[PDB]
Amino acid sequence: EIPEVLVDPRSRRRYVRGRFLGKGGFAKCFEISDADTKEVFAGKIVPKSLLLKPHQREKMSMEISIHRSLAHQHVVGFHGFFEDNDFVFVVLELCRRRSLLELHKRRKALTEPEARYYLRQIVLGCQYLHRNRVIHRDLKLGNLFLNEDLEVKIGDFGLATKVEYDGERKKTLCGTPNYIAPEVLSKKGHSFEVDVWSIGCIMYTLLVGKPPFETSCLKETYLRIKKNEYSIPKHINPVAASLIQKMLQTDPTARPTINELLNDEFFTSGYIPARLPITCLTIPPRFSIA
Amino acid sequence: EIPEVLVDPRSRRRYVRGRFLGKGGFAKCFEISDADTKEVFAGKIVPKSLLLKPHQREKMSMEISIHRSLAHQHVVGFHGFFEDNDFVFVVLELCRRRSLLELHKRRKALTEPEARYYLRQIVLGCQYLHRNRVIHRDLKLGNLFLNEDLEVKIGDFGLATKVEYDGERKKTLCGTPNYIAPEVLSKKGHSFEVDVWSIGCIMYTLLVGKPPFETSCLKETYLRIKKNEYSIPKHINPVAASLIQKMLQTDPTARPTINELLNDEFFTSGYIPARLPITCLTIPPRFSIA
Ligand SMILES: CN1CCN(c2ccc(OC(F)(F)F)c(Nc3nccc(-c4cc5c(n4C)CCNC5=O)n3)c2)CC1
Ligand SMILES: CN1CCN(c2ccc(OC(F)(F)F)c(Nc3nccc(-c4cc5c(n4C)CCNC5=O)n3)c2)CC1
Ligand SMILES: [Zn+2]
Ligand SMILES: [Zn+2]
């Protein structure tokens, strides 16, 4: 039940409503063209019917509050919002190569160089957020979008929470992150390390080709995480592996900080492409010498 | 996309498909008439599209396994099942007065006598299950259906689990019970007392007119439960109250068993109607003397 055009009565531009893209939570998502400067965006579009409750409403505002304060190369750009009466409309930078999720569906395990390339940009983006006292809290392959030059842009700040003062332990998380950290489940109080944990699972998943804790039942998975029950295939390199081990530790005070991450030998003693062939979208890159 | 008639190719009868009633999980639910003996039932009807995964499938079988083994006056009667290719069809005893939930929406707090009356039948039904090594695991006002003489019948065994051997602690619960017990949340291993806990919340809710741990956010509620944070209004009688206190204790080894429940002075020193006026559906009963 969503209008063909979208008008921003305050910044004044309107948007022709493009094709479906994806959806997540009470949100569905489409591309959309500025219709005058003709420029192209992704528009996240939430029905106010799903938002009848004040608790849902706040969650949604909070996300705009957090996301809108953010500018940086590996974060999905926030270009504004507005609402009618049935809908909230948010304008985002458009990522034309979808998300890491889709790339994974299609390449399963990646080559090491690809892992570094992508992983590095994931960390740079997370270095950004952490330095602004923001925790994403649901870093996963489907929130890591890729623009046209296959650059990573972090997305969906709907579980993103703001750190309000040094030492704060966020005591609850209203939602179900994919790669959820141990300390969240042991309902124990959590902070930035949850993102290091998630990145730990991303790394596994990209190198190993599957999630570090997958099982047919969610609650069993949660069990696994809590007891820290995973294993790293023997073919994964020993340097790669141990960075995983670093981040996938049940005690957050032991996991690397986002900032010392890029230093790890995985990165510094390894080859990191400068860019990627769009081929790499479907064919393992060989990185030959000419 | 559900057939007008329903045929059981093995017990041979077919069912004319009546009016909507309710829904819960992947299930929607209708009344249905035997079409020959013309008798009336509620039919729970699950699309096999929601059941593509083996884990969902098992959950559903388990429920049929548990529920079908059950016969007793305060349990929703199991009258059979069968499937086509798009649907699972289950035939249930029809409860023409909906559930305690609806009665609560309309009367908020109940008179003590009503509470006993209903509560007693809840316990008798639960005494039954517990003696058959079955835990319902999601006793709540909307699973407590009422037939025509306003008798309680327990329903929905889709989180019901079977106890397989003395001492067993069920380690996980794949779902989100309403009135969920502390030990479930502290991911700690649980058994029959979870139902005593739930009944504890039912009692509160029926007497006090609202749930013992309600808050605008679910995760805050869970916090409350874990820390056992509730309070009993001062107008609730002292005998009533303390039965609540008994059942709403964080340590399951302290909560009354289902079997010693009916002994509690709440019941034995109190007036318990033999039946209820259907008036009581919308008007507080006075229980005069003629
Ligand atoms: C799991 N997958 C994640 C990525 N998917 C996707 C498919 C086609 C797309 O446009 C194209 F073709 F140009 F590349 C895009 N591109 C895109 N660009 C900016 C924001 C969002 C977005 C932000 C959000 C969502 N989306 C799709 C959905 C949920 N909430 C969001 O925050 N998506 C993404 C499909 C689903
Ligand atoms: C929260 N409410 C619970 C009770 N509700 C309800 C409304 C109208 C009804 O028929 C009438 F009019 F004759 F009284 C009934 N009667 C009824 N009788 C047997 C089984 C089920 C049932 C079993 C199950 C469900 N139902 C409605 C839904 C979810 N899963 C079940 O196991 N429901 C129930 C409405 C929703
Ligand atoms: Zn499960
Ligand atoms: Zn919440």
Domains of chain B: 10-98 (3.30.200.20), 99-271 (1.10.510.10)
| Ligand 2 pocket, residues with Cβ under 6 angstroms | B 21-24, 27, 29, 31, 42, 44, 76, 92, 94-99, 101, 142, 145, 155-156
Straight-line distance from the first to the last Cα atom of chain B, in angstroms, rounded to the nearest whole number:
54
Distance from CA of residue A50 to its chain's centroid?
23
Residue nearest to atom 24 of ligand 1 (CA): A156
Please tell me if residue A187 touches chain B, with a CB cutoff of 8 Å. yes
Of A113, A79, A74, A89, which is closest to residue A285 (Cα–Cα)? A113
Report whether B201 belongs to an annotated binding site. no
| Partners of B45 in the β-ladder | B28, B89
From the alpha carbon of B42, which atom of ligand 2 is closest? 19
Cα–Cα distance list, B95 to A160, B69, B178, B194 (Å): 45, 19, 21, 25
Sequence-distant (≥ 6) Cβ neighbours of residue B86 within 8 angstroms: B1, B2, B47, B48, B49
Contact A223 B185 (CB under 8 A): no
Cα–Cα distance list, B51 to A103, A154, B57 (Å): 27, 33, 5
Give the position of tokens 């003397």. B289
Number of neighbours of residue A207 by Cβ within 10 angstroms: 25
Resolution reached, in Å?
2.7
Report whether B48 belongs to an annotated binding site. no
Please tell me if residue B220 touches chain A, with a CB cutoff of 8 Å. yes
Please tell me if residue A58 touches chain B, with a CB cutoff of 8 Å. no
Q: In chain B, which residues have their Cβ closer than 8 Å to the Cβ of A218?
A: 174
Report whether B93 belongs to an annotated binding site. yes
Q: In chain A, which residues have their Cβ closer than 8 Å to the Cβ of B187?
A: 185-186, 222-223, 226
DSSP string, A115-148: HHHHHHHHHHHHHHHHHTTEE-----TTSEEE-T
- Method underlying the structure: X-ray
CA distance B43 to B286: 36
Burial class (CB in 10 A: 0-12, 13-18, 19+), B129: buried
Q: Name the residue of A68, A98, A281 whose CB sits within 8 Å of the most ligand 1 atoms, as the mutation to test its pocket.
A: A98
Suggest the residue from A55, A58, A59, A183 to mutate for an interface test with chain B (most B CBs closer than 10 A).
A55
- Cα-to-centroid distance, B58 and ligand 2 (Å): 23
In sign, the C-alpha dihedral spanning B249, B251, B254, B255 is positive
Strand ranges (E), chain B: 5-7, 14-24, 27-33, 40-47, 78-83, 87-92, 134-135, 144-146, 152-154, 161-162
CA distance A236 to A234: 6
